[PDB]
Amino acid sequence: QFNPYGDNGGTILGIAGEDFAVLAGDTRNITDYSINSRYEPKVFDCGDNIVMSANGFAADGDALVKRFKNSVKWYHFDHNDKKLSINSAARNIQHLLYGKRFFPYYVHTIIAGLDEDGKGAVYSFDPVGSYEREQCRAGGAAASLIMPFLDNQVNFKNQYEPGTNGKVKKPLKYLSVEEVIKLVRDSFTSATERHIQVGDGLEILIVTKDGVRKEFYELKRD
Amino acid sequence: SDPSSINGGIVVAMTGKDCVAIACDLRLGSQSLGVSNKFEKIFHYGHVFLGITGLATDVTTLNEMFRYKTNLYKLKEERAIEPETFTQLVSSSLYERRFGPYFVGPVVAGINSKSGKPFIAGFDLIGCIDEAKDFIVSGTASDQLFGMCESLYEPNLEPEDLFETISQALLNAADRDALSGWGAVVYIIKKDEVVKRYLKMRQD
Amino acid sequence: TQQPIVTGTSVISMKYDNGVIIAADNLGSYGSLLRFNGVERLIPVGDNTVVGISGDISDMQHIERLLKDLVTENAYDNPLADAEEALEPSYIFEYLATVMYQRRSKMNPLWNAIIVAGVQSNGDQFLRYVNLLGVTYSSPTLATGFGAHMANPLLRKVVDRESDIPKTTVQVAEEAIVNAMRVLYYRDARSSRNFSLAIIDKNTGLTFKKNLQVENMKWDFAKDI
Amino acid sequence: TTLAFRFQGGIIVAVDSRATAGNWVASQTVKKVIEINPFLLGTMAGGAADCQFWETWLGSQCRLHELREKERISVAAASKILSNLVYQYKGAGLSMGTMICGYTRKEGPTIYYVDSDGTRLKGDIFCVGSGQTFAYGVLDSNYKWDLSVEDALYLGKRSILAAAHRDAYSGGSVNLYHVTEDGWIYHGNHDVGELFWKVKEEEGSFNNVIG
Amino acid sequence: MDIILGIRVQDSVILASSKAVTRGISVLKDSDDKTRQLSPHTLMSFAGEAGDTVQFAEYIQANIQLYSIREDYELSPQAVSSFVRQELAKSIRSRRPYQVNVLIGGYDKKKNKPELYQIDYLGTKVELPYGAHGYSGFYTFSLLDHHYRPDMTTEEGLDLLKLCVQELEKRMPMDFKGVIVKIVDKDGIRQVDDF
Amino acid sequence: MDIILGIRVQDSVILASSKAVTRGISVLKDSDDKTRQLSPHTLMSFAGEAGDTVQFAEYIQANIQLYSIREDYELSPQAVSSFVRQELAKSIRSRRPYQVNVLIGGYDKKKNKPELYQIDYLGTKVELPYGAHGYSGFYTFSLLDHHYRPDMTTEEGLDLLKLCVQELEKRMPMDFKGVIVKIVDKDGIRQVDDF
Amino acid sequence: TTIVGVKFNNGVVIAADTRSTQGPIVADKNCAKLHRISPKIWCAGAGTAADTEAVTQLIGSNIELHSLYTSREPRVVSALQMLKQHLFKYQGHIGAYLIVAGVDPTGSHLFSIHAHGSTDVGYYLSLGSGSLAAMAVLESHWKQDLTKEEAIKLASDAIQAGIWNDLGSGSNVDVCVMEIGKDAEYLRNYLTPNVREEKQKSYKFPRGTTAVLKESIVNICDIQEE
Amino acid sequence: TIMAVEFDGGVVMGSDSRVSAGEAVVNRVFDKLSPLHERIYCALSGSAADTQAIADIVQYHLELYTSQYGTPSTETAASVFKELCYENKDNLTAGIIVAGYDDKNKGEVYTIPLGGSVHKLPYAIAGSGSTFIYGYCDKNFRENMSKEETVDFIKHSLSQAIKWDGSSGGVIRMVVLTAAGVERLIFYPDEYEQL
Amino acid sequence: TIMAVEFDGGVVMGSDSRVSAGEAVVNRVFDKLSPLHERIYCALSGSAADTQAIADIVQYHLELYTSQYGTPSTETAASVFKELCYENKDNLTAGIIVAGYDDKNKGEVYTIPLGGSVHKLPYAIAGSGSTFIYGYCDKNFRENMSKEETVDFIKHSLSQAIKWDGSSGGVIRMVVLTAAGVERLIFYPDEYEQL
Numbered sequence A: 001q002f003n004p005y006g007d008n009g010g011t012i013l014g015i016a017g018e019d020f021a022v023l024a025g026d027t028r029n030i031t032d033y034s035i036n037s038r039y040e041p042k043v044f045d046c047g048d049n050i051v052m053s054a055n056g057f058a059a060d061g062d063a064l065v066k067r068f069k070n071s072v073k074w075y076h077f078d079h080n081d082k083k084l085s086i087n088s089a090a091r092n093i094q095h096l097l098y099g100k101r102f103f104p105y106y107v108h109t110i111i112a113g114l115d116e117d118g119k120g121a122v123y124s125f126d127p128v129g130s131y132e133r134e135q136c137r138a139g140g141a142a143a144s145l146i147m148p149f150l151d152n153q154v155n156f157k158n159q160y161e162p163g164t165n166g167k168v169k170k171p172l173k174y175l176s177v178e179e180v181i182k183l184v185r186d187s188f189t190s191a192t193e194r195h196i197q198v199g200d201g202l203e204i205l206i207v208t209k210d211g212v213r214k215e216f217y218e219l220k221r222d
Numbered sequence B: 001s002d003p004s005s006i007n008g009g010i011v012v013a014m015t016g017k018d019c020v021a022i023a024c025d026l027r028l029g030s031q032s033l034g035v036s037n038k039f040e041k042i043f044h045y046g047h048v049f050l051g052i053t054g055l056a057t058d059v060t061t062l063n064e065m066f067r068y069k070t071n072l073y074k075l076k077e078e079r080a081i082e083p084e085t086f087t088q089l090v091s092s093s094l095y096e097r098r099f100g101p102y103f104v105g106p107v108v109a110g111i112n113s114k115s116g117k118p119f120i121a122g123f124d125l126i127g128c129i130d131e132a133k134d135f136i137v138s139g140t141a142s143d144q145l146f147g148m149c150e151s152l153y154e155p156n157l158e159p160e161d162l163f164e165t166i167s168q169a170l171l172n173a174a175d176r177d178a179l180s181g182w183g184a185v186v187y188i189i190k191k192d193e194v195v196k197r198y199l200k201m202r203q204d
Numbered sequence C: 001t002q003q004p005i006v007t008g009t010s011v012i013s014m015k016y017d018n019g020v021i022i023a024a025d026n027l028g029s030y031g032s033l034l035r036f037n038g039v040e041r042l043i044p045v046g047d048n049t050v051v052g053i054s055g056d057i058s059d060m061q062h063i064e065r066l067l068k069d070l071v072t073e074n075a076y077d078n079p080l081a082d083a084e085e086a087l088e089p090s091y092i093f094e095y096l097a098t099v100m101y102q103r104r105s106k107m108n109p110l111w112n113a114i115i116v117a118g119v120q121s122n123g124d125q126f127l128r129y130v131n132l133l134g135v136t137y138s139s140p141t142l143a144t145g146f147g148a149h150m151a152n153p154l155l156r157k158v159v160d161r162e163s164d165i166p167k168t169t170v171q172v173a174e175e176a177i178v179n180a181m182r183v184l185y186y187r188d189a190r191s192s193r194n195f196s197l198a199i200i201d202k203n204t205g206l207t208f209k210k211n212l213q214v215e216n217m218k219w220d221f222a223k224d225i
Numbered sequence D: 001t002t003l004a005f006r007f008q009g010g011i012i013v014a015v016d017s018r019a020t021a022g023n024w025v026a027s028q029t030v031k032k033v034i035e036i037n038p039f040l041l042g043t044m045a046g047g048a049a050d051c052q053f054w055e056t057w058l059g060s061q062c063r064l065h066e067l068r069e070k071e072r073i074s075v076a077a078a079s080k081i082l083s084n085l086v087y088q089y090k091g092a093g094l095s096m097g098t099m100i101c102g103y104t105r106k107e108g109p110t111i112y113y114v115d116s117d118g119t120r121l122k123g124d125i126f127c128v129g130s131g132q133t134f135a136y137g138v139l140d141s142n143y144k145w146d147l148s149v150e151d152a153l154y155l156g157k158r159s160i161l162a163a164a165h166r167d168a169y170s171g172g173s174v175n176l177y178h179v180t181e182d183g184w185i186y187h188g189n190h191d192v193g194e195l196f197w198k199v200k201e202e203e204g205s206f207n208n209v210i211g
Numbered sequence E, F: 001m002d003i004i005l006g007i008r009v010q011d012s013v014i015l016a017s018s019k020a021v022t023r024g025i026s027v028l029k030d031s032d033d034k035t036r037q038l039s040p041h042t043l044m045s046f047a048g049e050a051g052d053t054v055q056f057a058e059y060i061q062a063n064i065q066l067y068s069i070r071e072d073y074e075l076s077p078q079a080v081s082s083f084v085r086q087e088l089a090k091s092i093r094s095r096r097p098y099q100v101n102v103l104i105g106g107y108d109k110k111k112n113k114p115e116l117y118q119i120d121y122l123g124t125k126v127e128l129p130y131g132a133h134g135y136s137g138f139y140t141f142s143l144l145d146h147h148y149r150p151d152m153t154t155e156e157g158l159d160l161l162k163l164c165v166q167e168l169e170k171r172m173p174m175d176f177k178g179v180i181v182k183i184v185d186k187d188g189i190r191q192v193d194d195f
Numbered sequence G: 001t002t003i004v005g006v007k008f009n010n011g012v013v014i015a016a017d018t019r020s021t022q023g024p025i026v027a028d029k030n031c032a033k034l035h036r037i038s039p040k041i042w043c044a045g046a047g048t049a050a051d052t053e054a055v056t057q058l059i060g061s062n063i064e065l066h067s068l069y070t071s072r073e074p075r076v077v078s079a080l081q082m083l084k085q086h087l088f089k090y091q092g093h094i095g096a097y098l099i100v101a102g103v104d105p106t107g108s109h110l111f112s113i114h115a116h117g118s119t120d121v122g123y124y125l126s127l128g129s130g131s132l133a134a135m136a137v138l139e140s141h142w143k144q145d146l147t148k149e150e151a152i153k154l155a156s157d158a159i160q161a162g163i164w165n166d167l168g169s170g171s172n173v174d175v176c177v178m179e180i181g182k183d184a185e186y187l188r189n190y191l192t193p194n195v196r197e198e199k200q201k202s203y204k205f206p207r208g209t210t211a212v213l214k215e216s217i218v219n220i221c222d223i224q225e226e
Numbered sequence H, I: 001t002i003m004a005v006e007f008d009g010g011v012v013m014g015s016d017s018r019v020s021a022g023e024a025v026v027n028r029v030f031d032k033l034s035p036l037h038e039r040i041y042c043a044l045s046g047s048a049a050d051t052q053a054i055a056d057i058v059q060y061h062l063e064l065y066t067s068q069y070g071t072p073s074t075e076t077a078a079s080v081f082k083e084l085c086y087e088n089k090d091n092l093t094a095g096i097i098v099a100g101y102d103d104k105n106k107g108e109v110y111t112i113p114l115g116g117s118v119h120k121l122p123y124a125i126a127g128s129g130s131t132f133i134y135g136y137c138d139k140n141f142r143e144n145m146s147k148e149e150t151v152d153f154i155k156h157s158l159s160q161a162i163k164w165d166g167s168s169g170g171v172i173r174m175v176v177l178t179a180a181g182v183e184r185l186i187f188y189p190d191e192y193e194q195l
């Protein structure tokens, strides 16, 4: 019987700062136990200061990014070159995904950029289009290895003030871009060690009021 | 249906500078229903500690079995079984049921009384030994425990730092599994003193 | 939904300093029967692109017609068809990828794995893969079916990362491809000795070699066992 | 776990904030009450996507109603748009359990249970989802018509906490709502992380747990 | 089947167990005692597959009564529960496992302390302040989580159980034809004849 | 499917219908009216799959109300039942059949006679002196076969229905939370409030 | 798993990767797949990790006893035969895939064995998820009259192919060199090409960071005198 | 691909050298001809495990027979194979050709297909490759061929079977069983492909 | 069993004459060589219904072609079969050989297997009986044979296929396609069995 889905592996990571956001993804593409590519970009600048990744089935991920990129083009045409806001982008993507409710895109989607107040925004979706704004989100293969680390090292969970014996929680502060990139790099070093589908390369897209910057880091190739 | 995830729960162990730690959540559920907040998964035979995750009936049966086996070991050898040897006894004992296994994820931790060397080990359900230096994880939130440990863990931690690291690795792993949590215990083990701590964690 | 009937095995390919190489055996298998011994699975498009196809040979013959019909159509009302508005590798690829993903999305796929090998207008090497699922990826080396397991490890010892490409000559690249085809003959139960190889070089153009043979085979050690 | 009950002082609506992918906890901070308009709330249990998509849509149908008829839609009508929509989709595998809670002048305070089998029920009390039985146990055994607004809000919060505790697939926090003739009022987000301990200490309950 | 509750109070244990026996679309009996005295200070309630329930209950009873005669002594609730658990844990890997869940309510005359054990057909044992098997737990656990206190009297214990049966008569689909209630204390086992 | 009874006596048809609505392990509601007035002198009770039951009943109610306006006239009970059977008979060979069973109780003002029609989801129609859908029948048919008389008053037909409801409360596995009872006679449709 | 065995002029060499995995997760980053049946007979295993380890130890034991009863150095053909009759009796249910290699009075030997009980002879062999990657390198570079130095290189290169190109294989290269008239030499972590780089951050927390409900001391010791 | 041919001077056995797992070639230079006695060989086809386990047992049975009753007849070797293959037919995938040279009966060939029946034949072909050469072998076989003719007939036959069968390849090994003893022949791709 | 062979003079097609329904022979003297045009013929293998349905449509299309564009190439006939077979691959069990004679191109053989693929070959074999003659046909086919050599090669080839295949048999019909036109040949069992 023909199976129209596959699994291309990989893992992605979205972190919202105060006046920036990052969307990172390994550049490894796999099927079963074979490597297809050591550098197949998965995180895309979609214009309007929005970065997007659809991790899972690369055919479905590529199709969705393509359709959303088109949606941004047709929004400029239809609404007088108006900037598509991240909250509006997320609602459009909910409709793109839910459109295929009874033959889903097998992807976990994260988008990132700034909200209309200039603050860092991360939104994450299920395959069938359910979605929430979040300070943190890992998706794909190593999501279970990375999320817990981010609950601890981004929203200071299960961390208390020493000598308050659990009365006072560690106060939740915004992180520098330098501190966020460190938690991203450490997340993908850890993920590469303990997951066979993650490795080769790390690509980070950083979104500020000045635009989209890229950083690349080598990962272990085994 | 999948016996290893009816009751739920997790164990983790870690090595430090002349010490080990082993910790477990306290949950026993029947799938969605929480039943008990007091189901400890870490037992001890002399100075050797065994954590066991999986089907709770088997957790209990294996603990009853290894108590039995280490008691006779001690009467005949005239000394307490050491961690290395007990590890072989667990592996032997599980492999005996190769075609009818105990649905468990055992974890051994303890200090060799003669070499002073910290020791940890884990096993699949048919007794394949994993003897990592760094850390061992087991249970319904194993994926999570691997993620927390691999990022948090550094070698040669002092007992009071190690306590923080294994506590934070377990707590944050458990908050991301529906079938773990409901309380937690951490054992800090040195060559001749063992501190047992109950952790304050969320009850959902 | 169908099942593949007459099949072709591995297609194998790599970039080198000044272009790309692609090779594939000349066998149409029929389950375990090695039925058809003169099948050409490298299908050139213009003088700057070769498409290599593995999987169902009925679906390959269809895809070959689609490519012949794409050349005709691009020449229609197009005075620059042999110059600036000639078909590029990247155009031919994107068309195939569109068709493959659309066909899988109607639950009626073209039961194939495809590798588009060519040099662009600007002289850049093009090498991209697509299959019956519409999954696509690029890499300094690409192989299908068995070739993924055995050809890529050998070809990646020559071009492990992008930076290796400009250091790889055509003679080194071709030697690696020829050796890889020998290893696949030894080890793939549905391979043949007889294959085709195409070089697309940004200076010397398209070189298409038919009726190559695996030689320098080691069978000597057999008598001792 | 989600509940809503009618009393002397209007309607109490309370939900947890957990999303599950099998045994994987996907989020602790998810919203399960959609504010359709100032006098109309919808609760969400089931398929995360089915609930978000068809309930923000219901919001759009309710807006078009008031433009077309120059009048805010009856809870009866708002609920029946949704129950007629899921009824169209019956056997296609939509998974939705909702309470449409609101006030209008013609109806008074009104709750309608709507589920993806196409059941639609009016009633004074409902609990919906994996932890409804848990919430039902605390709610049913403390519920009087003549609760104060303060007591009802607390019984609603405590009924969720109860389910947050026992049900493996409920938790995170409690979102609280009070609906009056003057519309809905949000009464905050209460993390079970702090609420379980505060409630245990203050009430002397939850003795089953290591204190 | 379906309704067996246990609550351990200050100085007693209270077992409440449904009177209905239903095969197909008929309630055959409405007065069924789903309990066996194992010893004068240990009572076992049981629910599960037809036949297996009583065959397991009566089997355990006969063993505990044998131990009692042989040693002219009464095993602790802890000892009885451990015996019972091991029997189930042995059954679960048998040709045809006993499909039976039990509560064991006993007064320990040595420790002067009531004890409730909950054991499932797999041999999963836990000591609880309150317990239930099957669907009942879905209602009664969250209820007791709110209303229970360790230092409750037997009279408070019985009021707390009435709350549990009412909640079950309101929200359960089947008619379990009420419960039989029995108190295990320092003076033994007695049936509450009005509930 | 829940419990729905009907019984035609001398000069009225009486419809008794359970109040429980049950979803999995929870009774969501215990006051549900499983009935739509089709016209002033024709009542239809219904039981079957969730959604389908109300959706089918309301659809029929709309269609008869429409007729009643158009002709300024009330279709006979016979005519309404023929209409309802034909919709179900059309429904069974549809893409997704209506999974609903109905009793239609009607007072024909022309012939001055009560009429009870039993119709299953296949469109199987029968005129009966008493009828039931689902497991209810298995107890109530033999019972009414004993007691029922053709010339009974409405009071006698209500006592005869108390017998049927007691037998079901005694021997049925499920708690159906009693019945709402309605009387269709020459003066229309009324509800007994105490039963 | 990727294992190879390569015969040479005066002996046989055996090599393996050092990664053990539970599904797509890595359990042991520096696992040891190179097991000892007798002092001069080593094998390496793929498939069910427990099954291969049980079967090595059981046949290692019986070979040790046989060697004592016969007063002879044990032979590979014996380990081979015992393994294949055990695995065949169990009809594939003992998921043990082994490359077995030794030196004995008869000379140097190299055999493979599959879970169903089939056996294989050759001058080079590969096994596991990585076997096709390894066999590509072996088929490309193997010649008659390999020296010890060439056979180790060819063995490690064949494991490396597995490490890089197979997701089921990774970490380090373990080697054992069994040369005629010499002690077996087991080169644990021969190659070490996958060391984790320094992390950007220490996650050592401040003491007090965790909330504690109850402390207590546990007696590990036996009951004391007086 | 395996065959045996009985000629003037004795008998010749021939095989390909391919062991495959699915479409992967596990060994491309395996020896499928195995000695049972000094001048009694088998050619194995089917499961690698099943054929080897059997061949090992038949070796043992003839070694024991030789110790007790001296050289067994090729017929006796065939019988041992038949007996094993027939009694274990539900768990064996093994197709065997047995060829032998005694001094009384000279060259004999026996074939044992899946069932475990035995067939004495002038020549036998078997294995996946054989299907493609039934026509060629039938039109080319003669009785009373020379050694040079028989080796040629078998070279050509297996040459064709290798070409057409994906489950056959490598070298063609043969074994010549005459009064003079046992001779081992190998033929490589370059020699046989250009036939 | 069907084959076509291209020789000097033109091209020859041949087939067996057996139609079977499981192990029953429904017709033993059927003609499987069907004319598409005056000097273009097809040989049918597969489902009797699917091969007939398709051959009738191809014949229709070439009759239309002939009206409008004149006598079609052998290639063009192959093409129409390819199109039907490929576009309808999920509901067809048909394997077709197409042989014809132009005066430009002379003899031409095309084969369309189950795929819907098309192959131009000097000779082609297909049908169940073809598996057994791959060896024979490969070894015996030369280029530029005479008519009589080509008839012999086919008679020998199909005799083997009939002898070994249970699904083939009866008579061998052939059709010789040359500039002279169309010669129909038949060979009976007593002729070809003794080859």
Ligand SMILES: *C(=O)[C@H]1NC[C@@](C)(O)[C@](O)([C@H](CC2CCCCC2)NC(=O)[C@H](CCCC)NC(=O)[C@@H]2CC(F)(F)CN2C(=O)[C@H](C)NC(=O)CN=[N+]=N)O[C@@H]1C
Binding pocket: A106, A126, A127, A128, A130, D001, D002, D016, D018, D019, D020, D021, D022, D026, D030, D031, D032, D044, D045, D046, D047, D048, D049, D051, D052, D095, D128, D129, D130, D131, D132, D169, D170
């Ligand atoms: C009280 O009873 C609560 N029970 C908990 C609960 C989780 O069951 C739920 O029903 C919530 C309610 C949702 C939460 C999101 C906001 C709208 C209401 N239900 C879920 O969380 C829902 C259950 C799915 C099964 C019915 N979860 C999902 O659908 C999850 C959510 C997600 F994000 F992870 C995505 N998802 C999936 O199932 C996705 C689509 N599937 C996969 O990941 C697997 N497919 N593949 N490959 O809340 C009650 C209120």
Ligand SMILES: *C(=O)[C@H]1NC[C@@](C)(O)[C@](O)([C@H](CC2CCCCC2)NC(=O)[C@H](CCCC)NC(=O)[C@@H]2CC(F)(F)CN2C(=O)[C@H](C)NC(=O)CN=[N+]=N)O[C@@H]1C
Binding pocket: G114, G118, H001, H002, H016, H018, H019, H020, H021, H022, H026, H030, H032, H044, H045, H046, H047, H048, H049, H051, H052, H126, H127, H128, H129, H130, H167, H168
């Ligand atoms: C000529 O006709 C030859 N054609 C090939 C053949 C398959 O018919 C075969 O019988 C060979 C030769 C054997 C070699 C050993 C000595 C006896 C003769 N048979 C195989 O190679 C055998 C075929 C299986 C199905 C017929 N292959 C295997 O047993 C291989 C060996 C193995 F180890 F790898 C495992 N295996 C498997 O088939 C098992 C079942 N594995 C799998 O199915 C999946 N992969 N794995 N593990 O020679 C004819 C004479």
Ligand SMILES: *C(=O)[C@H]1NC[C@@](C)(O)[C@](O)([C@H](CC2CCCCC2)NC(=O)[C@H](CCCC)NC(=O)[C@@H]2CC(F)(F)CN2C(=O)[C@H](C)NC(=O)CN=[N+]=N)O[C@@H]1C
Binding pocket: I001, I002, I016, I018, I019, I020, I021, I022, I023, I026, I030, I032, I044, I045, I046, I047, I048, I049, I051, I052, I126, I127, I128, I129, I130, I167, I168
């Ligand atoms: C040479 O290789 C020939 N092999 C013989 C052959 C019979 O298989 C066949 O393929 C012929 C070719 C056709 C004959 C019809 C005229 C055009 C050429 N095929 C059949 O005879 C065909 C075989 C079906 C299996 C492939 N037979 C039928 O379809 C027969 C005809 C029928 F009427 F009787 C019905 N039928 C059936 O098969 C029906 C459908 N019954 C069954 O399928 C099962 N019955 N039982 N038990 O010629 C080769 C060229």
Ligand SMILES: [Cl-]
Binding pocket: G114, G115, G116, G117, G118
């Ligand atoms: Cl195997």
Ligand SMILES: [Mg+2]
Binding pocket: B174, B175, B176, B177, B178, B179, B180, B181, B182, B204
């Ligand atoms: Mg948890």
Ligand SMILES: [Mg+2]
Binding pocket: B203, B204, D163, D164, D165, D166, D167, D168, D169, D170, D171
């Ligand atoms: Mg919970």
Ligand SMILES: [Mg+2]
Binding pocket: B035, E118, E119, E120, E124, E125
């Ligand atoms: Mg239990």
Ligand SMILES: [Mg+2]
Binding pocket: I162, I163, I164, I165, I166, I167, I168, I169
């Ligand atoms: Mg025949």
